[PDB]
């Protein structure tokens, strides 16, 4: 399962 | 430190989505990932918070559950939306003083490949209507009518105006307008039920009352838009984006002029919220700060809460609708962040009320990715990147 786009925004 | 009064650890991986029954705040649904392997599906649960045992289970998603909502006005349906693009619709029954809430799978559809968000329509005229925004930029509006489960889902609108991923959506308070924003920097405010068009208040595309894009230099936020909110009178929409930028745009009452442009913070505005009863707008940023603006004073800066969540992103801010302590109505703001902490703020000044710990921090694989707090704010239920759901009391 994947991670949503917003998580990739949060991460840096 | 762990301030939680209850917890649910059933999720095998990160929890991305949470929704709450509008009549029964104790009924909460959570959704996320069962693992980072391709063969790991998505999974959702329904909890009754009144170690928690789920009262229902949401299966069928082959990818992470990304969005959940109960319908307005009465939570007749529960809808899940996945990164697989599946939308699953369940009927909801809550016994009077019979027993636990019950759920029945009604239908599944796949209008898009990946659902980013849901928002239920607040219009009393159009019950059980919901909107979603997707990775292909599309925005869909559906109405759910339990009679005829050969087709319980009807399509009210399917908008294809954004090109890049549709990152957020917000209804006007009367539920007639739907404002959505995109990574491609565009804002569209749709005339969902045709009212504006009948009053000659729509743009040339016949679909929106406001359409602003990257070609509009006064509006364009380089790097994209990620948040949107509509003021309690429906008079303006706020959009938040890269670089800490916020734009304020006029709406027709039932337009499209930039009323203010804000840039106090330094990184993505990931969450925007108008107070329901105080003349203020709160903005949460990836730089860890919250900024509060005075909506009756050209969005003058009221306060800049630097390090509200240290230097970790502020994921969500939301005002408590009707706290038990009515003096604080409209002034109480709840926030959560990638520092793994939930906080509540008194925004009357020009203010930390409480903080709730328990989640791991982002650097430890945690961070709070969402929460609900009901109308009164007295119970806060969180979903965490650390695969735990927590319950806090106010």
Residue numbers in the entry:
A (entry chain Y): 2 to 13
B (entry chain A): 54 to 103, 128 to 331, 367 to 462, 490 to 533
Which passages does the manuscript contain on this structure?
In the case of Sqt1, we were able to decipher the mode of L10-N peptide binding by X-ray crystallography. These structural analyses showed that the C-terminal domain of Sqt1, which is preceded by a non-essential N-terminal extension of ∼50 amino acids, folds into an eight-bladed WD-repeat β-propeller. Moreover, the binding mode of the N-terminal residues of Rpl10 (L10-N) by the eight-bladed WD-repeat β-propeller of Sqt1, as revealed by X-ray crystallography, allows establishing a refined model for the final pre-60S maturation events that lead to the stable incorporation of Rpl10 and the release of Nmd3. Taken together, we propose that Sqt1 may protect Rpl10 from aggregation before and/or promote its incorporation into almost mature pre-60S subunits in the cytoplasm. We conclude that the β-propeller domains of Sqt1 and Rrb1, which harbour the essential function of these proteins, recognize the very N-terminal residues of Rpl10 and Rpl3.
